[PDB]
Ligand SMILES: COC[C@H]1C[NH2+][C@H](C)CN1CC(=O)N1CC(C)(C)c2cnc(Cc3ccccc3)cc21
């Protein structure tokens with residue numbers, strides 16, 4: 001799978017700019033919004049809806065309409081420094097508590 005980057009230095013600096021990430025998508029048919037994705041640090045791999053974060057290297061796929069780019073970034077890549085910079089730890093905790101409390105009402 002490859003370990004997530006938790007340093008303050010991006011794993012993919014060529015994708016550090018919003019505009020660079022935006023080009024990777026092209027025509028995007030998926031339920032998830034490409035500008036929203038690029039904003040959350042993601043660029044497209046060109047394989048279905050597979051994206052990676054420029055900073056942590058974290059990969060995500062199979063975007064349901066109910067799944068938010070930032071929330072998913074926090075769910076699966078909580079050590080991402082870009083995520084911490086943009087959203088703050090207070091936002092990150094809420095998302096974590098929300099997901100971890102979803103583990104309650106399902107089970
Ligand atoms: C499949 O789980 C549920 C889905 C549902 N839709 C959400 C938007 C996201 N969510 C997590 C996810 O997609 N994960 C979690 C985990 C970290 C375990 C992981 C590992 N590898 C891949 C595949 C991949 C490899 C390389 C680049 C991109 C994608 C996807 C993936």
Ligand SMILES: [Zn+2]
Nearest residue numbers: 053055056080
């Ligand atoms: Zn990240």
